Amino acid sequence: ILELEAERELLNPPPSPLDKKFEQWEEQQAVEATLAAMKARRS
Amino acid sequence: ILELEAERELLNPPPSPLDKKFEQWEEQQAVEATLAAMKARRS
Amino acid sequence: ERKYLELKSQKNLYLARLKSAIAAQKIEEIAGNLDNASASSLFERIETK
Amino acid sequence: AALDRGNEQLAREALGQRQSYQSHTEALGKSLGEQRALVEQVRGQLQKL
Amino acid sequence: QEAPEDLLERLLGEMELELIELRRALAQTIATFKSTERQRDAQQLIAQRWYEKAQAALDRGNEQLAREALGQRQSYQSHTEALGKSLGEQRALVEQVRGQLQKLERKYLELKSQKNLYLARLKSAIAAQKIEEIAGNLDNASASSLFERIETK
Amino acid sequence: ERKYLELKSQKNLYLARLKSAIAAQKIEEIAGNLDNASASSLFERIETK
Ligand SMILES: Nc1ncnc2c1ncn2[C@@H]1O[C@H](COP(=O)(O)OP(=O)(O)O)[C@@H](O)[C@H]1O
Ligand SMILES: Nc1ncnc2c1ncn2[C@@H]1O[C@H](COP(=O)(O)OP(=O)(O)O)[C@@H](O)[C@H]1O
Ligand SMILES: Nc1ncnc2c1ncn2[C@@H]1O[C@H](COP(=O)(O)OP(=O)(O)O)[C@@H](O)[C@H]1O
């Protein structure tokens, strides 16, 4: 099982942890900015 | 193992340490100059 | 007899995992990634054509 | 916007990261430069022939 | 020796075939690296059981019994330490291997992307030589140009 | 028996390293470096042709 899974990951380099950090790091502002405007837009 | 690795390096002279020094020595200004302009271009 | 069942109850589970991964390998190699630009992805081979 | 929150440290990695990509762009730009003027000479031979 | 152009096509075909074999082999290395690590966790779990058992072993005041458990788990701890060191060297070894494979693949393309370009130039010039010798220049007046040979006829 | 496994668990690792380096040597000699200008690189041999 592990033999096959190893081939796929190498042939398709998964995202680097730094890229993962940025992706989630971006979403917090998006939800907070929308939530920040949620209170403002409603009031 | 070491026998083969020895042949490759000799037949393809790897960069000299002085060349390595210049390469990294150059990048610091490039990132700093871009970062120096990053603050300036934004503000 | 008690020991016999504990094996069979797991054999089906392993086969399912094996079928899942083997298929996944088959799918991925046919990914046809556009970025290859080497004919390894059949799509880019078409684009060259 | 990496340091827009004041997160200067994070922006350091990005600018350092993109330099590696820039190296490939410069290498390819030079490679095409010689090819561009090479084929144009070939076309002249075919047309004259 | 053969024509230099013919070798180029054959040589790369061998090169591409070899690379995937390297890719396949490296995967098997990862399997053992992961397999032993999973195996390592099992042993310490067993030692934890004895330690957990030894926690209440003397809870009844039975200090003597707990002596055997703590002495027993030391043997297991030895294997854990031995394996931890073994993985440490393997972990940093394969990572170096992956770099060679990735660099080789990047270097591989830069050759193929140019091979087709060279062949086109070779076919262009070789044909040009073939055309020119059949130029049949009228000025030769020596039968070298087949046209003037006809004129003599 | 305990000593037996410790050997087999490493044999596969050594073979992988051996296959990696042997292939690397095969690739490099076919590098076809443009700078040779001596026909050692098959590309420059073509250029002379
Ligand atoms: N971030 C990326 N993710 C996946 N593939 C990429 C990425 N960047 C570049 N590539 C492509 O991966 C390919 C690997 O080269 P090649 O050996 O021809 O394909 P294969 O891996 O199928 O053999 C390159 O041609 C390149 O265009
Ligand atoms: N300006 C010119 N350009 C090309 N050919 C010429 C010119 N002036 C004369 N010639 C011809 O070139 C020929 C060369 O001689 P010959 O050796 O018989 O032909 P080849 O070069 O095919 O062997 C002469 O016979 C002559 O008639
Ligand atoms: N910085 C360099 N890196 C690699 N090769 C170089 C460099 N500078 C020059 N060369 C080339 O290396 C070649 C070595 O000569 P030669 O013995 O013909 O090739 P080989 O090493 O394949 O036998 C020279 O012909 C030269 O053109």
Short mmCIF file of N, CA, C and O in Angstrom, two decimals, chain C:
data_model
loop_
_atom_site.label_atom_id
_atom_site.label_comp_id
_atom_site.label_asym_id
_atom_site.label_seq_id
_atom_site.Cartn_x
_atom_site.Cartn_y
_atom_site.Cartn_z
N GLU C 1 -11.35 -21.44 16.09
CA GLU C 1 -12.51 -20.85 15.43
C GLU C 1 -12.64 -19.38 15.79
O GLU C 1 -12.92 -18.54 14.92
N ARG C 2 -12.45 -19.03 17.06
CA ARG C 2 -12.50 -17.63 17.46
C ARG C 2 -11.41 -16.83 16.77
O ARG C 2 -11.64 -15.69 16.33
N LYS C 3 -10.21 -17.40 16.66
CA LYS C 3 -9.12 -16.71 15.98
C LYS C 3 -9.37 -16.62 14.48
O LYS C 3 -8.90 -15.68 13.83
N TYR C 4 -10.10 -17.58 13.92
CA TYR C 4 -10.35 -17.58 12.48
C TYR C 4 -11.08 -16.32 12.04
O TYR C 4 -10.71 -15.69 11.04
N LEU C 5 -12.13 -15.95 12.77
CA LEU C 5 -12.97 -14.83 12.35
C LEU C 5 -12.19 -13.52 12.35
O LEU C 5 -12.36 -12.69 11.44
N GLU C 6 -11.33 -13.32 13.34
CA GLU C 6 -10.62 -12.05 13.46
C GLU C 6 -9.77 -11.76 12.24
O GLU C 6 -9.45 -10.59 11.98
N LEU C 7 -9.40 -12.78 11.47
CA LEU C 7 -8.67 -12.57 10.23
C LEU C 7 -9.60 -12.17 9.10
O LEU C 7 -9.35 -11.18 8.41
N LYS C 8 -10.68 -12.93 8.91
CA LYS C 8 -11.59 -12.66 7.81
C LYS C 8 -12.23 -11.28 7.95
O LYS C 8 -12.43 -10.58 6.95
N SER C 9 -12.55 -10.88 9.18
CA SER C 9 -13.18 -9.58 9.39
C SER C 9 -12.30 -8.43 8.93
O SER C 9 -12.80 -7.33 8.72
N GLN C 10 -10.99 -8.67 8.78
CA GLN C 10 -10.07 -7.63 8.33
C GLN C 10 -9.67 -7.77 6.87
O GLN C 10 -9.26 -6.77 6.26
N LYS C 11 -9.79 -8.96 6.29
CA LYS C 11 -9.30 -9.15 4.93
C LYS C 11 -10.04 -8.25 3.95
O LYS C 11 -9.42 -7.62 3.08
N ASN C 12 -11.36 -8.15 4.09
CA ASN C 12 -12.12 -7.28 3.21
C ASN C 12 -11.70 -5.83 3.36
O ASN C 12 -11.68 -5.08 2.38
N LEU C 13 -11.35 -5.42 4.58
CA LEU C 13 -10.92 -4.04 4.80
C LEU C 13 -9.63 -3.73 4.05
O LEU C 13 -9.50 -2.67 3.43
N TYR C 14 -8.66 -4.65 4.10
CA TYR C 14 -7.39 -4.41 3.41
C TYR C 14 -7.59 -4.33 1.90
O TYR C 14 -7.02 -3.45 1.24
N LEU C 15 -8.40 -5.22 1.33
CA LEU C 15 -8.62 -5.20 -0.11
C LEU C 15 -9.19 -3.87 -0.56
O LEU C 15 -8.80 -3.33 -1.60
N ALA C 16 -10.13 -3.32 0.21
CA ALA C 16 -10.72 -2.03 -0.15
C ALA C 16 -9.65 -0.94 -0.21
O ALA C 16 -9.62 -0.14 -1.15
N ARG C 17 -8.76 -0.91 0.78
CA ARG C 17 -7.68 0.07 0.76
C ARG C 17 -6.78 -0.15 -0.44
O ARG C 17 -6.35 0.81 -1.09
N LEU C 18 -6.47 -1.41 -0.74
CA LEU C 18 -5.62 -1.71 -1.89
C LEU C 18 -6.27 -1.25 -3.19
O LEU C 18 -5.60 -0.66 -4.05
N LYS C 19 -7.56 -1.51 -3.36
CA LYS C 19 -8.25 -1.08 -4.57
C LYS C 19 -8.31 0.44 -4.65
O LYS C 19 -8.27 1.02 -5.74
N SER C 20 -8.42 1.11 -3.50
CA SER C 20 -8.49 2.57 -3.50
C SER C 20 -7.19 3.18 -3.99
O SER C 20 -7.19 4.06 -4.85
N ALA C 21 -6.06 2.71 -3.45
CA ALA C 21 -4.77 3.32 -3.79
C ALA C 21 -4.34 2.96 -5.20
O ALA C 21 -3.87 3.82 -5.95
N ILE C 22 -4.50 1.69 -5.59
CA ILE C 22 -4.09 1.27 -6.93
C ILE C 22 -4.82 2.10 -7.98
O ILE C 22 -4.21 2.57 -8.95
N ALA C 23 -6.13 2.30 -7.80
CA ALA C 23 -6.88 3.14 -8.72
C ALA C 23 -6.36 4.57 -8.70
O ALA C 23 -6.21 5.21 -9.75
N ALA C 24 -6.06 5.09 -7.50
CA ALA C 24 -5.58 6.46 -7.39
C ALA C 24 -4.30 6.66 -8.19
O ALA C 24 -4.13 7.68 -8.86
N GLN C 25 -3.39 5.68 -8.14
CA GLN C 25 -2.18 5.76 -8.96
C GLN C 25 -2.53 5.79 -10.44
O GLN C 25 -1.93 6.54 -11.21
N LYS C 26 -3.50 4.97 -10.85
CA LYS C 26 -3.89 4.93 -12.26
C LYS C 26 -4.45 6.28 -12.70
O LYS C 26 -4.17 6.74 -13.81
N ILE C 27 -5.26 6.91 -11.85
CA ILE C 27 -5.86 8.19 -12.21
C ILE C 27 -4.78 9.26 -12.34
O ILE C 27 -4.77 10.04 -13.30
N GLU C 28 -3.86 9.32 -11.37
CA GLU C 28 -2.93 10.44 -11.31
C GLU C 28 -2.02 10.47 -12.52
O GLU C 28 -1.75 11.55 -13.07
N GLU C 29 -1.52 9.32 -12.96
CA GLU C 29 -0.62 9.30 -14.11
C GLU C 29 -1.31 9.83 -15.36
O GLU C 29 -0.63 10.28 -16.29
N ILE C 30 -2.64 9.78 -15.40
CA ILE C 30 -3.41 10.30 -16.53
C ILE C 30 -3.84 11.73 -16.22
O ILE C 30 -4.70 12.29 -16.90
N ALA C 31 -3.22 12.33 -15.20
CA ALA C 31 -3.60 13.68 -14.82
C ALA C 31 -3.51 14.64 -15.99
O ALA C 31 -4.29 15.60 -16.08
N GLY C 32 -2.57 14.41 -16.91
CA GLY C 32 -2.42 15.27 -18.06
C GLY C 32 -2.16 16.70 -17.66
O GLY C 32 -2.78 17.63 -18.18
N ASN C 33 -1.23 16.90 -16.72
CA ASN C 33 -0.94 18.23 -16.22
C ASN C 33 -0.55 19.15 -17.37
O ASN C 33 0.28 18.80 -18.21
N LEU C 34 -1.16 20.34 -17.40
CA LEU C 34 -0.88 21.28 -18.48
C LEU C 34 0.54 21.84 -18.37
O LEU C 34 1.13 22.24 -19.38
N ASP C 35 1.10 21.88 -17.16
CA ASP C 35 2.39 22.53 -16.94
C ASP C 35 3.57 21.72 -17.45
O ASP C 35 4.67 22.27 -17.55
N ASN C 36 3.40 20.43 -17.77
CA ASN C 36 4.55 19.61 -18.13
C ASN C 36 5.26 20.17 -19.36
O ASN C 36 6.48 20.36 -19.36
N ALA C 37 4.51 20.44 -20.42
CA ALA C 37 5.07 20.99 -21.65
C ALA C 37 6.18 20.10 -22.20
O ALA C 37 7.19 20.57 -22.72
N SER C 38 5.98 18.78 -22.08
CA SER C 38 6.97 17.81 -22.52
C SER C 38 6.36 16.60 -23.21
O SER C 38 7.10 15.67 -23.53
N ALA C 39 5.05 16.58 -23.45
CA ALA C 39 4.29 15.47 -24.02
C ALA C 39 4.05 14.38 -22.99
O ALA C 39 3.36 13.39 -23.31
N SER C 40 4.58 14.50 -21.77
CA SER C 40 4.23 13.55 -20.72
C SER C 40 2.74 13.62 -20.40
O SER C 40 2.08 12.59 -20.23
N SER C 41 2.20 14.84 -20.31
CA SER C 41 0.77 15.04 -20.25
C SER C 41 0.20 14.99 -21.66
O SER C 41 0.62 15.77 -22.53
N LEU C 42 -0.74 14.09 -21.90
CA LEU C 42 -1.28 13.93 -23.24
C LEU C 42 -1.92 15.21 -23.75
O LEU C 42 -1.97 15.43 -24.96
N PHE C 43 -2.41 16.07 -22.85
CA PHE C 43 -3.01 17.33 -23.28
C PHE C 43 -1.97 18.24 -23.93
O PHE C 43 -2.19 18.77 -25.03
N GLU C 44 -0.83 18.43 -23.27
CA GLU C 44 0.22 19.25 -23.86
C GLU C 44 0.76 18.64 -25.14
O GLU C 44 1.17 19.36 -26.05
N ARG C 45 0.75 17.31 -25.24
CA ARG C 45 1.11 16.67 -26.50
C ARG C 45 0.15 17.07 -27.60
O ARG C 45 0.56 17.34 -28.73
N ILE C 46 -1.15 17.14 -27.28
CA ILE C 46 -2.13 17.63 -28.24
C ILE C 46 -1.83 19.07 -28.61
O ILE C 46 -1.87 19.45 -29.78
N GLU C 47 -1.52 19.90 -27.61
CA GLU C 47 -1.25 21.31 -27.88
C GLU C 47 -0.08 21.47 -28.84
O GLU C 47 -0.12 22.31 -29.75
N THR C 48 0.97 20.67 -28.66
CA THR C 48 2.07 20.69 -29.61
C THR C 48 1.60 20.30 -31.00
O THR C 48 2.02 20.89 -32.00
N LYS C 49 0.70 19.31 -31.09
CA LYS C 49 0.17 18.90 -32.38
C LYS C 49 -0.57 20.05 -33.06
O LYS C 49 -0.44 20.26 -34.27
#
